[model samples]
Target chain A: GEFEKRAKELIERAKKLNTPAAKVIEAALKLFIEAYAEAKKKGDALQQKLLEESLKQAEAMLRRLEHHH
Target chain B: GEFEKRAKELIERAKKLNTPAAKVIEAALKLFIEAYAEAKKKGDALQQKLLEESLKQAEAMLRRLEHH
Candidate 1:
């Protein structure tokens, strides 16, 4: 039931200090949340599903902060 | 060309939510800021462009909070 497996790679890539890919991934994470909010209000099934998946991606990236050197 | 027009409706909607959708938008807002930082660091054109577009969208929503 967890989406961690799907988002692991992109999330891991985001950890790099600076790169275009990292920026795109970061932007995607933010946009996903915004879209999720919009979808939540309308009760749209697609948005909700996508949002859950996006959050998993974001959370994956977030986890890195805990182990930062 | 204020982004307000584009994002006003969505922002208003998020303000009303207490559900998964609202959580999504909330999460988006948080993620956008993080992405912006990343984009700024890399100086990549595509990322910067997308980041600006996304910021416009987020700002549009934020504007509603001010007006509300």
Candidate 2:
């Protein structure tokens, strides 16, 4: 919930700032990493796995962004 | 200097946490992106480009970490 909310806010800000998709993705990945770290530290294996997968997908998306840029 | 110092500190923490290099790279990318955003907002094009390049390199390193 928090993550989605924050992401939505960032998307709004990105729109306002006229920020590129790459930049928005950059910010989202950063936030995801932080949440992933906390999840791992808390020993939530399920959450950790989810986050790891999310990270992988995000990385793929990031690569696409880089390619387009 | 700030970025380097912080990265070093994170490396130490990662070791202590027995964190995977992938995870460490993940964290470093996060920090780099944040710094990049700030540079962009400040209109520091040179610094922004530097950070952007750093992010690309970090992403490559991250993929290697993922693969290995």
Candidate 3:
């Protein structure tokens, strides 16, 4: 999936920068939500579905990070 | 306002942590949107308005970060 691939790249970039994983994930989730809003406004069902799924995965990742921390 | 105060604190914390301002603002905006969703679901107009305004400011901050 394109989003997954891009998400992995973001994680790797954050790691290289020594930024916290949770912060990177949070930024990604936030961007996803912003995209979701645009999709909703444009009535793009496919884009909305993709963003919703991405957000769910991002939230799950965040929960795991929180649990570990 | 509580949100403004909180947002300022977040910016300070992020700076202390040496995180990029854009990333911090993005996280704040995301959290605000999530809160806005919950507030909307509960029909809490005031909370929703507050979150919306916070989001706007965060976005403006993000733009500045992007520009600079």
Candidate 4:
């Protein structure tokens, strides 16, 4: 219930994030990070492999993002 | 072997895609599409779930990209 509520809010926020495309793209990256974290929690190998493909290049970027945001 | 060779080339090309961040992001989207195709081929439940989550929003975007 709590998760769905926040996800719905995120979706709504994404919809309103229309002024800039790169902003939306970065939002999508964080969304992917959500999926990646869930995959890590579930010990899902296939999920990890697929998510890691996108994350591989973003590794350092994400690290900096975490420290600040 | 062929896969690794091409993937390596793709990595090098991405390295040179320094002019724009959005371009690099679109490149990542295609990279994710590659993974999604592999997931579709293998009938991997969890894999598809994760990949589709991203593709869902991009479906229409991808369709126009494809029809051209």
Candidate 5:
């Protein structure tokens, strides 16, 4: 549910993107989705921890890309 | 950041409820918000784990309210 909530917002944001920035945002969201789905299916504590870390990194990359323009 | 990410969504969902169900969901969301705020402020490992567990409990309560 947490993932769904953030994922929807991320998708909405992605839909508004254009250019290389769109690619960056889309990739971040895609990676987040993958992590979320994996967490949902496997529910591994270590994997969940890694996913959370990866999601933060992905979000940071997207923010950097947005600000670089 | 993860807290903000989920928080925004929880707020949006909170906007779409009514009556006793809304109250139940609202309480659950509030508990989560408190946990998030605490975790953000303290940034303790044990606190983080507790916050996560609290969130899951709140979510389960919300689901039960939704179904009942």
Candidate 6:
């Protein structure tokens, strides 16, 4: 397995900041916004798949939190 | 018109950051995250309506942008 490929880094330039969490949440904010619009149109397949899977992982943790709290 | 009724603010208490812009985007991050889950189960009407209408406003500005 050339698993290094999926380790997935555009990890070169630390333009604004090097800390990943500094930026990731901004994507979270917008991703849901766009994902819903795409859902309505049923436009583009790959995006749907990606969002759908992330949707599952999100639910998994949500379940964990629900039980924990 | 009794318009101030829906002027809609919990507009009090500046705990951490009062700029409004500072905190609003953090909500944007989690809102979309939570809204989708509620969508699947179709649970709770108020959350759905709130998310739906914000969806409209977001679309409005989104339309105003260059690539509309």
Instruction: Give the winner by DockQ.
Output: 1
Candidate 3 per-residue lDDT, tens place, A1-69, comes to: 455455555455444433244454546654765665666677866555545455555545544444432
Best prediction by TM-score: 1
TM-score of 6: 0.27
Q: Provide per-model DockQ scores.
A: 0.22, 0.03, 0.02, 0.04, 0.02, 0.04
List the lowest-lDDT window of 10 residues for candidate 6 chain A: A3-12
| Each model's lDDT | 0.53, 0.54, 0.52, 0.45, 0.51, 0.34
Off by over 4 Å in 2: A1-69, B1-19
Q: Please provide, for model 6 over B17-43, each residue's C-alpha lDDT reduced to its tens digit, 9 standing for 90 to 100.
A: 343222332344345445545443555
lDDT of 4 by residue, B1-68 (tens): 33334444444444444322223334555655566566567675544554444444334333332343
RMSD of 5: 14.3
Candidate 1's C-alpha runs over 4 A off are A20-48, A52-69, B1-9, B33-45, B52-68
DockQ of 2: 0.03
Query: All candidates' TM-scores?
Result: 0.42, 0.36, 0.36, 0.29, 0.40, 0.27
TM-score of candidate 5 chain A against the true chain A: 0.63
lDDT of 1 by residue, B1-68 (tens): 23333344555566665545455555565555555566566665565555456555555444443354
Clashing pairs in 6: none
Model 1 Cα lDDT, one tens digit per residue, A1-69: 233333444455575645554555656654654565566567787556645654664554444323457
Q: lDDT of model 1 at residue B33?
A: 53
The better candidate by lDDT, 5 or 6, is 5
Candidate 3 chain A TM-score vs. reference chain A: 0.63
Cα deviation at A11, candidate 4, in Å, is: 18
**Model 5, B25-68: lDDT tens per residue?**
45445555665665567564544544455455445544443554
* Better candidate by lDDT, 4 or 5: 5
Interface DockQ of candidate 5: 0.02
Worst 10 residues of 2 chain B by lDDT: B10-19
Return the lDDT, model 4, position A7. 41
lDDT of prediction 1: 0.53
Candidate 5 clash pair list: none
> Where in model 4 is the C-alpha error above 4 Å?
A1-19, A56-69, B1-68
For model 3 the interface RMSD, in Å, equals 13.1
